[PDB]
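Why predict the complex rather than its parts? Because the way molecules touch one another can change local conformation, and only a joint prediction can capture that. The input here totals 1376 residues.
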Amino acid sequence: EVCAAVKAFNKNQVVELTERKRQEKQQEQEDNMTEITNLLHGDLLSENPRPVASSFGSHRVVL
Amino acid sequence: KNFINTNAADVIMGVAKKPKPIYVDKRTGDKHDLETSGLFPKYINKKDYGI
Amino acid sequence: MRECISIHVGQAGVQIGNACWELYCLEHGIQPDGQMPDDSFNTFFSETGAGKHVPRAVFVDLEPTVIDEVRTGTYRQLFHPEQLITGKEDAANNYARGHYTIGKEIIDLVLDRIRKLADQCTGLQGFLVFHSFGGGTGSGFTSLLMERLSVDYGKKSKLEFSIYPAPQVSTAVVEPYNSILTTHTTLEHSDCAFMVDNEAIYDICRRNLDIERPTYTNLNRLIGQIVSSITASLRFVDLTEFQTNLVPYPRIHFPLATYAPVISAEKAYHEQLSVAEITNACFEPANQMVKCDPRHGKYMACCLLYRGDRTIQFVDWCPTGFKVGINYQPPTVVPGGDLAKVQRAVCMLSNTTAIAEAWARLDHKFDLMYAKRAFVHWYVGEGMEEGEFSEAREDMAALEKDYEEVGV
Amino acid sequence: MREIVHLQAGQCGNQIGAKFWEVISDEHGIDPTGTYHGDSDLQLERINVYYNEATGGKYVPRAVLVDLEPGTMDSVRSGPFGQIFRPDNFVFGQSGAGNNWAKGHYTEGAELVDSVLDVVRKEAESCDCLQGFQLTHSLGGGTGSGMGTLLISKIREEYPDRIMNTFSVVPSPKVSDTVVEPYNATLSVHQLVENTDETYCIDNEALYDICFRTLKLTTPTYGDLNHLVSATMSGVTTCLRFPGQLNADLRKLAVNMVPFPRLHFFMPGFAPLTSRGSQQYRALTVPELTQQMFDAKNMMAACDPRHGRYLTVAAVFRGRMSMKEVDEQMLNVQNKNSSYFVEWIPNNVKTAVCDIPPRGLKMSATFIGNSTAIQELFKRISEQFTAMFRRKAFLHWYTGEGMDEMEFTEAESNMNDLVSEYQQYQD
Amino acid sequence: MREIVHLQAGQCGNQIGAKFWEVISDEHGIDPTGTYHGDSDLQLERINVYYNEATGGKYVPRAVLVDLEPGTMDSVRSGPFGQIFRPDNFVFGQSGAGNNWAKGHYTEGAELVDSVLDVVRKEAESCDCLQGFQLTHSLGGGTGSGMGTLLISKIREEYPDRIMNTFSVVPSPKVSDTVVEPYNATLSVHQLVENTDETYCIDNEALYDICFRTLKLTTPTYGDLNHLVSATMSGVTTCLRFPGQLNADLRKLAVNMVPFPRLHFFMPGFAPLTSRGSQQYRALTVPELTQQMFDAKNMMAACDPRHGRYLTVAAVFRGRMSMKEVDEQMLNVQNKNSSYFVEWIPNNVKTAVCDIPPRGLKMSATFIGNSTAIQELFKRISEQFTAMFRRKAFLHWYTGEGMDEMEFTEAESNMNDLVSEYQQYQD
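Output of the joint prediction:
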């Protein structure tokens, strides 16, 4: 009986550990998507010319 | 050149290959070397030992 | 009346003591606030008249950014705010900074708080010092602490739990200089130093448990289990009989450590864990906590701590070599931990001849550096003479011939 | 409570610093006014390492901006982040150095060090425990090299137990834009060997190489080479501000890569540098950081580490990662290469792990390698210094400032011996 | 656990090996963008033999495309499945080989050989246990054969325990679209002798006999010939990817068919090739797969094994089928014929059964045979090399590239002994 409830607790714990592993893998894929989306939106790889705009005015640029 | 005689002579007058010792740890075939892990006694054989 | 003052020096000490004190809180009823929602906590806790329970520990570091997380974490209300001692600048992997220049700013404060903690306890068994050989503070300030504790606290037990440097992996370049210059000055000032290294616990957490890529917390929890199994007979043998039954000669105080069932909850269902199984699994070289092998040496002593319900060859002069202790409380599972729930466990502390290869490798790497005088200017300029390298090396030469002499 | 004072000289040191401070302020949530607009509590916790609190919640940097002409103090003041700098910290003279070392060291810069040392003695007294200084300057100019190595010699006599990093832009033989380059570079490497604790060597032909073959930029400006440098400049101070599992001071890195007191010229690198086309191919793990960190396409200096032994190596990781995987890749890169690592140092690589990644990344890393392939960098200078000086090509500018010819002879054998000093551990 | 790093060289080498990947990817259920859309798990459990993982559940092949001109590395990219490859693995030079074997072996392909052994080591040291490489090339061109033997000559020395398979397209006997063919092929078969574990021999003329006489197509093309090569490439390496009742690796065929180390030239084939109209009558049983492996019209080399003797025979069966009925037919052909089998090997046939069939078929079969009628190939290359080389015809297009005339004289006598080697296992 005591062996039975220890084995049942072990089986249940195996189910929760497997679900925790699945959850952290899916969260890793989410962070990968955030990685690549932010790096494509970044101005270094987009090369938008607006980064040459200067606070002094719209006629002068940053060298 | 007698290829049959030379092939036989090459495979009789020689030496055998000596493998690097490798031990498997897990049940899924994980392979590691032996002489650089801490198991087989290698570094007590040094001549500096105890002095 | 059976207290144990704990001292945690270094980042290794603080991050191990976090796991240890979480387990100590959960074994009794103590919430992380400090209130219980029986007096067996008295070996580790103090009962303020305002209902609060305060631990008997001192956390020391020369850097503030690993104690500030304890100060802002979940266990913020539990600790006395001045049982956590911090410096401003760390020791920077330098035994000289950690011994002579920086550690002298904190040694008096640590001794003051230790005296204040030891005045509460009626019957004090001894101290437990958690440290790491490789770091700056854990190698310099720890040795300075034992030097200034030997003259102050008598013939008390001074147990050490150390992270000995691993045989092939380390997180520093300058580690062997520390690892020899601390052993030379703690050889005569200690009673028993259980040594576990991180590489063997990585092997066990990969192999026994199925945790590929573990972090330090999965190691700190197993260390906490071993310390609880050592001290559990005070709460539910003593600390005092360990130094009698493990250290024959006064320089050979270096035993080992093992916990017998370290298995996952998806393989505790498949097997018995009877006393013969766990006793056999203590003496297996795959389950030791130092990457070494006691087949290639000779056993000298063994202490077997059971908890809950012709290959092994001994030395000539010690035929018996066994001390056995039995406790009745089974080990307690923490939520989020990785071990199973079990009814029986064993912790074996064994003194063996097969640790000579560790000192031989350490001396080899110290020689390899120091023959060409690398890194010496850092250690010389921080108030430390050069000749101490020569005395530490000839002293550890004497130690290797000691390990051969006793075996012969 | 381990504060860092930033010192920055020349046009090169003022245009690196305008981009470094543009990176730190994003990392701590500071807008161009100076008010904290962030979404954590870790950012505000140790902002005092670089920022001084003002009244009203403002934060101003602990930087001193020096120059010898007033022309580069206006483009800094007219950038996006130019209004956070305290206006007293701009110290600028009205007659330039003119690509001349001697005017920077004896005539013009010597009348300005006493008006800069007043400023740095004001930010050395706001710190409860000052860690050390920082200089960014160019070795190929006249006021980065004359005044800049005049300040270090005067700082190191007043704060002699601190830490004095530099980020030297050493001249390149290919990307070079001054005839009188090797006179200033020879007379300044002589001034860095006995007055710094660490000196990271940067060549501009190695930053163009990274921006052409790895990031694949069409037109890299100087603003895209100042972003490469400033990502390493905050990668070595990142455990002083954010917590971790295994920290590293700047002092702890001085201990482990300086075996002998004159061997402190390193080569930086930064791990996750990638294109915009290769962003969905990259797998974002720790072995991919380690493969790119050690790549010889990747070092920020123009000397190849396949021509010499690696004396010692660093690694300063960021992110939430596994200490088993961090520690098993430094062992892995060390056992295949038997003769790329020096024999009398058995473990060469020191690792540290911080816990907070840069803004917009998952994890990152940094490399600070000490090699005996750095002595080819001081021999292309020493083959062009001696081609000119054997006939006295340009000396009349230099002699007529109070400077003698004998200083061009003592700064030859004092760099001819450092090449032989790095040579004796090459084999 | 058993990886294969694909190499492919030339315009022949890339137009073969771009159709092979469309064959494999629909054998495993991979859409043109790279993701997985399949209805099994045997399609996915052994996919690591050929496919590196990418992010988001996307798989990229382990293929490296080398070439010496950028025109044929944009028809590959603009095909149907051309977007699955990682773009770094595309390697192309800027100036062609020019059908010149010297130009690709010594001059143009000796600086490109250093730039591809960076690529092939990043893909070889990322495998858990490397089984062995491949190659696909032609012995008539310049970059397939000149540089393409320089690769095998080099990466046998660095990796001498692994497997090096090749899929040669040796020159055709009848059709010849290059005058300077025989200098290419004679100088290349010497490099195949020492450095290669297995080599198949494919003639483009004997691919034309299949696609007209047997498959009965109105218009064949170089996609209906690159489907025949790829349907033999998949048959040798399908017991690595799919379970069977009896397995056969890439080693277990080379162990059995290569007795002596100089004799590794084989003769492929493929059994169920039937027309639309004749399909109603054909496609019956397992005796109709052993009938058409061994038919002498189906060989993919233009050399007939009736002229000589099968040293060793092999067969790889695909489909879920009877372990008895496979074994009874190989007993049936080994006993009816006597002088088509060598005397000193009494079990000349090795057999293998793979469960998962090819795409669209319910059963299939594949052949490899090893003959002493493969040495009529080299007696026809050497009849047209020393025809030309007697009066020194095209010699300046090779000698002015850095060769000499006695590199020719040894390379014919490095073929006029392997001809007379095979003539002594004749009797």
